Each structure stands twice: as C-alpha cells, then as structure tokens.
C-alpha cells in the first residue's frame, strides 16, 4: 500500500519511532519518502551484489531479513523478507529499530545522508498533528 504523508506520520508515532535512539520522527519520514515514496510493496534488486531491498524503508536482505537467495547473508531482524512487504508496517518498524541500534544509526541508509542529513526536514511532518 502507498501511505498518505500524514497517515504514515501518525502511524510511526504510534509505533514509538519518534526519538527512537535519538532519531526524530521527521527523519524517519524523510527516509521513507526517499527510499520508497511511502510504498510498502517496493522492492529493488541490486544486481551488483545479489541482494534485494524490501519495503517502505528498503531494508537489505544481506543483513536484516532472509529471502534465501542472497549469498552469505544474515537475518539480524529474524524475519522473512516477505514480512517487510505487508500493508501493516509493524514488522518493518521493528526491523528498522534493529538497524539503528548498530553504531551507524540512521546513517546505515545512504539515501538519508544524501537527502535528509543537515536539511530542514520539518516539512515531512508539518500539519500532521504529531
Ligand atoms: Na538475509
């Protein structure tokens, strides 16, 4: 499903993402926007290393979820990558929380550095009532 901006913002708030490990809700919104356009069924195959990015946050199969076909992969989130393609974002959120518990934090996603870091991200949560 494709979330409406404010609809997603209120959902992430409810799932306890605001300020999780020091990451503001507007940052998570900026990340979801650039990674998938708020689309939970988005998948992106990386032919260069044989891995696939899954879901609204575009989480990688090499370390976070298991899809069986990625070489030398681990499943830190202990989830089938299929779980990251549901309309209910609870599992994707639980896994994103795991990703940011590692040293890099939000920096794990290169898109965040390119389009969110050091920018005015207030626009992503404006008018949403969060
Ligand atoms: Na994996």
GROMACS .gro file of N, CA and C and ligand atoms in nm:
model
  391
    1UNK      N    1   0.084  -0.123   0.000
    1UNK     CA    2   0.000   0.000   0.000
    1UNK      C    3   0.086   0.127   0.000
    2UNK      N    4   0.031   0.235  -0.054
    2UNK     CA    5   0.100   0.363  -0.060
    2UNK      C    6   0.039   0.457   0.044
    3UNK      N    7   0.114   0.483   0.151
    3UNK     CA    8   0.069   0.570   0.259
    3UNK      C    9   0.059   0.715   0.218
    4UNK      N   10  -0.036   0.784   0.281
    4UNK     CA   11  -0.055   0.927   0.263
    4UNK      C   12   0.050   0.980   0.361
    5UNK      N   13   0.106   1.098   0.336
    5UNK     CA   14   0.209   1.153   0.426
    5UNK      C   15   0.171   1.157   0.574
    6UNK      N   16   0.069   1.235   0.608
    6UNK     CA   17   0.028   1.246   0.748
    6UNK      C   18  -0.022   1.115   0.809
    7UNK      N   19  -0.079   1.030   0.725
    7UNK     CA   20  -0.128   0.900   0.770
    7UNK      C   21  -0.009   0.820   0.824
    8UNK      N   22   0.100   0.817   0.748
    8UNK     CA   23   0.220   0.745   0.790
    8UNK      C   24   0.281   0.807   0.916
    9UNK      N   25   0.290   0.939   0.920
    9UNK     CA   26   0.348   1.010   1.035
    9UNK      C   27   0.278   0.971   1.165
   10UNK      N   28   0.145   0.969   1.164
   10UNK     CA   29   0.071   0.930   1.284
   10UNK      C   30   0.094   0.783   1.320
   11UNK      N   31   0.110   0.699   1.218
   11UNK     CA   32   0.133   0.555   1.239
   11UNK      C   33   0.270   0.530   1.303
   12UNK      N   34   0.373   0.597   1.252
   12UNK     CA   35   0.507   0.579   1.307
   12UNK      C   36   0.513   0.630   1.451
   13UNK      N   37   0.442   0.739   1.477
   13UNK     CA   38   0.435   0.797   1.610
   13UNK      C   39   0.380   0.693   1.708
   14UNK      N   40   0.272   0.629   1.667
   14UNK     CA   41   0.206   0.527   1.749
   14UNK      C   42   0.295   0.406   1.776
   15UNK      N   43   0.381   0.374   1.679
   15UNK     CA   44   0.473   0.261   1.690
   15UNK      C   45   0.601   0.295   1.766
   16UNK      N   46   0.604   0.415   1.824
   16UNK     CA   47   0.717   0.458   1.905
   16UNK      C   48   0.848   0.495   1.837
   17UNK      N   49   0.839   0.548   1.715
   17UNK     CA   50   0.958   0.586   1.637
   17UNK      C   51   1.011   0.725   1.665
   18UNK      N   52   0.928   0.812   1.722
   18UNK     CA   53   0.972   0.949   1.749
   18UNK      C   54   1.078   0.956   1.860
   19UNK      N   55   1.201   0.984   1.819
   19UNK     CA   56   1.310   0.996   1.912
   19UNK      C   57   1.377   0.864   1.940
   20UNK      N   58   1.338   0.757   1.869
   20UNK     CA   59   1.399   0.626   1.891
   20UNK      C   60   1.549   0.633   1.863
   21UNK      N   61   1.629   0.600   1.964
   21UNK     CA   62   1.775   0.605   1.953
   21UNK      C   63   1.824   0.742   1.901
   22UNK      N   64   1.754   0.848   1.945
   22UNK     CA   65   1.788   0.984   1.907
   22UNK      C   66   1.742   1.030   1.769
   23UNK      N   67   1.663   0.949   1.699
   23UNK     CA   68   1.617   0.985   1.565
   23UNK      C   69   1.475   1.040   1.566
   24UNK      N   70   1.460   1.165   1.526
   24UNK     CA   71   1.330   1.231   1.525
   24UNK      C   72   1.238   1.170   1.420
   25UNK      N   73   1.108   1.185   1.444
   25UNK     CA   74   1.007   1.133   1.352
   25UNK      C   75   1.021   1.192   1.211
   26UNK      N   76   1.054   1.321   1.199
   26UNK     CA   77   1.071   1.382   1.067
   26UNK      C   78   1.185   1.317   0.986
   27UNK      N   79   1.285   1.264   1.056
   27UNK     CA   80   1.395   1.196   0.988
   27UNK      C   81   1.347   1.063   0.930
   28UNK      N   82   1.268   0.989   1.007
   28UNK     CA   83   1.213   0.861   0.961
   28UNK      C   84   1.123   0.885   0.840
   29UNK      N   85   1.047   0.994   0.844
   29UNK     CA   86   0.959   1.031   0.734
   29UNK      C   87   1.042   1.065   0.610
   30UNK      N   88   1.147   1.145   0.627
   30UNK     CA   89   1.234   1.180   0.515
   30UNK      C   90   1.294   1.053   0.453
   31UNK      N   91   1.334   0.958   0.538
   31UNK     CA   92   1.392   0.830   0.494
   31UNK      C   93   1.290   0.748   0.410
   32UNK      N   94   1.170   0.726   0.465
   32UNK     CA   95   1.065   0.650   0.397
   32UNK      C   96   1.030   0.714   0.263
   33UNK      N   97   1.023   0.846   0.260
   33UNK     CA   98   0.989   0.920   0.139
   33UNK      C   99   1.088   0.890   0.026
   34UNK      N  100   1.216   0.908   0.056
   34UNK     CA  101   1.319   0.886  -0.044
   34UNK      C  102   1.350   0.742  -0.076
   35UNK      N  103   1.328   0.653   0.019
   35UNK     CA  104   1.356   0.513  -0.005
   35UNK      C  105   1.248   0.446  -0.090
   36UNK      N  106   1.122   0.474  -0.061
   36UNK     CA  107   1.013   0.409  -0.132
   36UNK      C  108   0.896   0.496  -0.177
   37UNK      N  109   0.892   0.621  -0.133
   37UNK     CA  110   0.779   0.705  -0.167
   37UNK      C  111   0.659   0.661  -0.083
   38UNK      N  112   0.687   0.606   0.035
   38UNK     CA  113   0.585   0.558   0.130
   38UNK      C  114   0.509   0.434   0.078
   39UNK      N  115   0.580   0.350   0.001
   39UNK     CA  116   0.523   0.230  -0.061
   39UNK      C  117   0.575   0.104   0.010
   40UNK      N  118   0.484   0.032   0.075
   40UNK     CA  119   0.521  -0.089   0.148
   40UNK      C  120   0.557  -0.209   0.058
   41UNK      N  121   0.513  -0.208  -0.068
   41UNK     CA  122   0.544  -0.322  -0.155
   41UNK      C  123   0.666  -0.302  -0.245
   42UNK      N  124   0.735  -0.189  -0.228
   42UNK     CA  125   0.854  -0.158  -0.306
   42UNK      C  126   0.968  -0.259  -0.285
   43UNK      N  127   1.026  -0.303  -0.396
   43UNK     CA  128   1.140  -0.396  -0.394
   43UNK      C  129   1.239  -0.345  -0.497
   44UNK      N  130   1.367  -0.353  -0.463
   44UNK     CA  131   1.471  -0.307  -0.552
   44UNK      C  132   1.583  -0.408  -0.552
   45UNK      N  133   1.606  -0.472  -0.666
   45UNK     CA  134   1.714  -0.571  -0.677
   45UNK      C  135   1.848  -0.504  -0.711
   46UNK      N  136   1.951  -0.541  -0.636
   46UNK     CA  137   2.086  -0.488  -0.656
   46UNK      C  138   2.164  -0.600  -0.724
   47UNK      N  139   2.171  -0.592  -0.856
   47UNK     CA  140   2.239  -0.694  -0.936
   47UNK      C  141   2.388  -0.703  -0.905
   48UNK      N  142   2.446  -0.591  -0.862
   48UNK     CA  143   2.587  -0.588  -0.830
   48UNK      C  144   2.634  -0.682  -0.720
   49UNK      N  145   2.550  -0.705  -0.619
   49UNK     CA  146   2.586  -0.793  -0.508
   49UNK      C  147   2.484  -0.902  -0.476
   50UNK      N  148   2.383  -0.914  -0.562
   50UNK     CA  149   2.279  -1.016  -0.549
   50UNK      C  150   2.186  -1.002  -0.427
   51UNK      N  151   2.170  -0.880  -0.378
   51UNK     CA  152   2.083  -0.857  -0.264
   51UNK      C  153   1.959  -0.778  -0.308
   52UNK      N  154   1.855  -0.777  -0.225
   52UNK     CA  155   1.733  -0.703  -0.256
   52UNK      C  156   1.688  -0.617  -0.137
   53UNK      N  157   1.641  -0.496  -0.168
   53UNK     CA  158   1.592  -0.401  -0.068
   53UNK      C  159   1.440  -0.420  -0.063
   54UNK      N  160   1.386  -0.435   0.057
   54UNK     CA  161   1.244  -0.460   0.077
   54UNK      C  162   1.162  -0.360   0.158
   55UNK      N  163   1.045  -0.325   0.105
   55UNK     CA  164   0.954  -0.239   0.178
   55UNK      C  165   0.968  -0.090   0.185
   56UNK      N  166   0.889  -0.033   0.275
   56UNK     CA  167   0.883   0.111   0.293
   56UNK      C  168   1.018   0.176   0.331
   57UNK      N  169   1.103   0.104   0.403
   57UNK     CA  170   1.234   0.157   0.444
   57UNK      C  171   1.345   0.098   0.357
   58UNK      N  172   1.308   0.011   0.264
   58UNK     CA  173   1.406  -0.051   0.175
   58UNK      C  174   1.519  -0.119   0.254
   59UNK      N  175   1.481  -0.213   0.338
   59UNK     CA  176   1.575  -0.287   0.422
   59UNK      C  177   1.642  -0.400   0.341
   60UNK      N  178   1.774  -0.410   0.353
   60UNK     CA  179   1.853  -0.507   0.275
   60UNK      C  180   1.857  -0.652   0.325
   61UNK      N  181   1.841  -0.745   0.232
   61UNK     CA  182   1.842  -0.888   0.260
   61UNK      C  183   1.978  -0.947   0.302
   62UNK      N  184   2.087  -0.874   0.278
   62UNK     CA  185   2.219  -0.925   0.314
   62UNK      C  186   2.243  -0.934   0.464
   63UNK      N  187   2.180  -0.844   0.540
   63UNK     CA  188   2.200  -0.844   0.685
   63UNK      C  189   2.074  -0.851   0.772
   64UNK      N  190   1.965  -0.792   0.724
   64UNK     CA  191   1.844  -0.780   0.803
   64UNK      C  192   1.731  -0.881   0.797
   65UNK      N  193   1.699  -0.929   0.677
   65UNK     CA  194   1.593  -1.028   0.663
   65UNK      C  195   1.641  -1.141   0.573
   66UNK      N  196   1.571  -1.254   0.578
   66UNK     CA  197   1.608  -1.369   0.496
   66UNK      C  198   1.516  -1.387   0.376
   67UNK      N  199   1.576  -1.397   0.258
   67UNK     CA  200   1.500  -1.425   0.137
   67UNK      C  201   1.555  -1.552   0.067
   68UNK      N  202   1.649  -1.618   0.133
   68UNK     CA  203   1.708  -1.741   0.081
   68UNK      C  204   1.804  -1.736  -0.038
   69UNK      N  205   1.790  -1.636  -0.124
   69UNK     CA  206   1.874  -1.627  -0.243
   69UNK      C  207   1.990  -1.529  -0.236
   70UNK      N  208   2.008  -1.461  -0.123
   70UNK     CA  209   2.120  -1.367  -0.111
   70UNK      C  210   2.241  -1.442  -0.056
   71UNK      N  211   2.355  -1.437  -0.127
   71UNK     CA  212   2.477  -1.507  -0.082
   71UNK      C  213   2.533  -1.456   0.049
   72UNK      N  214   2.579  -1.550   0.132
   72UNK     CA  215   2.639  -1.517   0.261
   72UNK      C  216   2.564  -1.412   0.341
   73UNK      N  217   2.433  -1.428   0.350
   73UNK     CA  218   2.351  -1.333   0.420
   73UNK      C  219   2.319  -1.375   0.561
   74UNK      N  220   2.284  -1.276   0.642
   74UNK     CA  221   2.243  -1.299   0.779
   74UNK      C  222   2.101  -1.242   0.792
   75UNK      N  223   2.037  -1.272   0.903
   75UNK     CA  224   1.899  -1.231   0.928
   75UNK      C  225   1.892  -1.171   1.068
   76UNK      N  226   1.950  -1.053   1.085
   76UNK     CA  227   1.953  -0.988   1.215
   76UNK      C  228   1.815  -0.958   1.269
   77UNK      N  229   1.720  -0.927   1.182
   77UNK     CA  230   1.585  -0.897   1.228
   77UNK      C  231   1.502  -1.021   1.257
   78UNK      N  232   1.555  -1.137   1.220
   78UNK     CA  233   1.487  -1.265   1.239
   78UNK      C  234   1.348  -1.259   1.177
   79UNK      N  235   1.347  -1.217   1.050
   79UNK     CA  236   1.224  -1.203   0.973
   79UNK      C  237   1.244  -1.251   0.831
   80UNK      N  238   1.138  -1.306   0.772
   80UNK     CA  239   1.145  -1.343   0.632
   80UNK      C  240   1.130  -1.205   0.566
   81UNK      N  241   1.197  -1.182   0.453
   81UNK     CA  242   1.183  -1.053   0.386
   81UNK      C  243   1.039  -1.027   0.342
   82UNK      N  244   0.959  -1.134   0.331
   82UNK     CA  245   0.818  -1.123   0.295
   82UNK      C  246   0.743  -1.033   0.396
   83UNK      N  247   0.783  -1.042   0.523
   83UNK     CA  248   0.723  -0.963   0.631
   83UNK      C  249   0.735  -0.812   0.608
   84UNK      N  250   0.837  -0.771   0.533
   84UNK     CA  251   0.860  -0.631   0.502
   84UNK      C  252   0.781  -0.585   0.379
   85UNK      N  253   0.688  -0.667   0.331
   85UNK     CA  254   0.608  -0.630   0.215
   85UNK      C  255   0.459  -0.622   0.250
   86UNK      N  256   0.427  -0.631   0.379
   86UNK     CA  257   0.286  -0.625   0.423
   86UNK      C  258   0.237  -0.481   0.427
   87UNK      N  259   0.105  -0.464   0.432
   87UNK     CA  260   0.046  -0.330   0.442
   87UNK      C  261   0.063  -0.280   0.585
   88UNK      N  262   0.064  -0.373   0.681
   88UNK     CA  263   0.081  -0.341   0.823
   88UNK      C  264   0.231  -0.326   0.843
   89UNK      N  265   0.276  -0.205   0.874
   89UNK     CA  266   0.420  -0.176   0.892
   89UNK      C  267   0.487  -0.214   1.024
   90UNK      N  268   0.415  -0.281   1.115
   90UNK     CA  269   0.469  -0.319   1.245
   90UNK      C  270   0.602  -0.394   1.240
   91UNK      N  271   0.613  -0.495   1.153
   91UNK     CA  272   0.738  -0.572   1.140
   91UNK      C  273   0.850  -0.489   1.079
   92UNK      N  274   0.818  -0.409   0.978
   92UNK     CA  275   0.917  -0.322   0.913
   92UNK      C  276   0.972  -0.221   1.015
   93UNK      N  277   0.884  -0.171   1.102
   93UNK     CA  278   0.925  -0.076   1.206
   93UNK      C  279   1.012  -0.146   1.310
   94UNK      N  280   0.975  -0.267   1.351
   94UNK     CA  281   1.055  -0.339   1.448
   94UNK      C  282   1.195  -0.367   1.392
   95UNK      N  283   1.204  -0.391   1.261
   95UNK     CA  284   1.333  -0.421   1.198
   95UNK      C  285   1.418  -0.293   1.179
   96UNK      N  286   1.352  -0.183   1.144
   96UNK     CA  287   1.420  -0.056   1.128
   96UNK      C  288   1.480  -0.017   1.265
   97UNK      N  289   1.408  -0.047   1.374
   97UNK     CA  290   1.458  -0.018   1.508
   97UNK      C  291   1.586  -0.097   1.532
   98UNK      N  292   1.590  -0.222   1.486
   98UNK     CA  293   1.708  -0.306   1.500
   98UNK      C  294   1.826  -0.248   1.420
   99UNK      N  295   1.799  -0.203   1.298
   99UNK     CA  296   1.904  -0.147   1.214
   99UNK      C  297   1.974  -0.030   1.282
  100UNK      N  298   1.897   0.060   1.343
  100UNK     CA  299   1.955   0.177   1.409
  100UNK      C  300   2.017   0.155   1.546
  101UNK      N  301   2.010   0.033   1.598
  101UNK     CA  302   2.072   0.001   1.726
  101UNK      C  303   2.220  -0.028   1.706
  102UNK      N  304   2.260  -0.040   1.579
  102UNK     CA  305   2.400  -0.061   1.541
  102UNK      C  306   2.467   0.076   1.543
  103UNK      N  307   2.601   0.081   1.552
  103UNK     CA  308   2.679   0.207   1.556
  103UNK      C  309   2.640   0.320   1.459
  104UNK      N  310   2.626   0.288   1.331
  104UNK     CA  311   2.591   0.390   1.230
  104UNK      C  312   2.459   0.460   1.253
  105UNK      N  313   2.368   0.393   1.322
  105UNK     CA  314   2.237   0.452   1.345
  105UNK      C  315   2.168   0.474   1.211
  106UNK      N  316   2.105   0.589   1.196
  106UNK     CA  317   2.031   0.628   1.076
  106UNK      C  318   2.120   0.638   0.951
  107UNK      N  319   2.250   0.654   0.973
  107UNK     CA  320   2.347   0.665   0.864
  107UNK      C  321   2.360   0.536   0.782
  108UNK      N  322   2.308   0.425   0.832
  108UNK     CA  323   2.315   0.299   0.758
  108UNK      C  324   2.254   0.315   0.618
  109UNK      N  325   2.154   0.402   0.605
  109UNK     CA  326   2.091   0.424   0.476
  109UNK      C  327   2.159   0.539   0.407
  110UNK      N  328   2.224   0.512   0.294
  110UNK     CA  329   2.294   0.616   0.219
  110UNK      C  330   2.202   0.728   0.171
  111UNK      N  331   2.079   0.693   0.135
  111UNK     CA  332   1.984   0.794   0.090
  111UNK      C  333   1.958   0.899   0.199
  112UNK      N  334   1.961   0.859   0.326
  112UNK     CA  335   1.939   0.953   0.437
  112UNK      C  336   2.047   1.062   0.436
  113UNK      N  337   2.173   1.022   0.416
  113UNK     CA  338   2.286   1.115   0.409
  113UNK      C  339   2.270   1.211   0.291
  114UNK      N  340   2.232   1.158   0.175
  114UNK     CA  341   2.215   1.240   0.055
  114UNK      C  342   2.100   1.338   0.060
  115UNK      N  343   1.983   1.295   0.106
  115UNK     CA  344   1.868   1.384   0.105
  115UNK      C  345   1.804   1.431   0.234
  116UNK      N  346   1.853   1.385   0.349
  116UNK     CA  347   1.793   1.424   0.477
  116UNK      C  348   1.889   1.491   0.576
  117UNK      N  349   2.010   1.436   0.587
  117UNK     CA  350   2.111   1.489   0.678
  117UNK      C  351   2.141   1.637   0.655
  118UNK      N  352   2.138   1.714   0.764
  118UNK     CA  353   2.165   1.859   0.761
  118UNK      C  354   2.066   1.940   0.678
  119UNK      N  355   1.947   1.887   0.655
  119UNK     CA  356   1.848   1.960   0.579
  119UNK      C  357   1.734   1.993   0.672
  120UNK      N  358   1.645   2.081   0.628
  120UNK     CA  359   1.528   2.120   0.705
  120UNK      C  360   1.423   2.010   0.675
  121UNK      N  361   1.408   1.914   0.766
  121UNK     CA  362   1.315   1.804   0.744
  121UNK      C  363   1.178   1.826   0.808
  122UNK      N  364   1.156   1.946   0.860
  122UNK     CA  365   1.029   1.979   0.925
  122UNK      C  366   0.910   1.959   0.832
  123UNK      N  367   0.931   1.988   0.705
  123UNK     CA  368   0.826   1.976   0.605
  123UNK      C  369   0.754   1.840   0.600
  124UNK      N  370   0.827   1.733   0.631
  124UNK     CA  371   0.771   1.599   0.627
  124UNK      C  372   0.662   1.572   0.731
  125UNK      N  373   0.667   1.639   0.846
  125UNK     CA  374   0.566   1.619   0.950
  125UNK      C  375   0.471   1.739   0.970
  126UNK      N  376   0.487   1.842   0.890
  126UNK     CA  377   0.403   1.961   0.907
  126UNK      C  378   0.256   1.942   0.876
  127UNK      N  379   0.174   1.986   0.971
  127UNK     CA  380   0.031   1.975   0.958
  127UNK      C  381  -0.025   1.837   0.989
  128UNK      N  382   0.058   1.743   1.032
  128UNK     CA  383   0.008   1.607   1.059
  128UNK      C  384  -0.046   1.579   1.197
  129UNK      N  385  -0.028   1.673   1.289
  129UNK     CA  386  -0.076   1.655   1.425
  129UNK      C  387   0.005   1.559   1.510
  130UNK      N  388   0.135   1.554   1.485
  130UNK     CA  389   0.226   1.467   1.559
  130UNK      C  390   0.328   1.552   1.636
  131LIG    NA1  391   1.932  -1.223   0.483
   0.00000   0.00000   0.00000
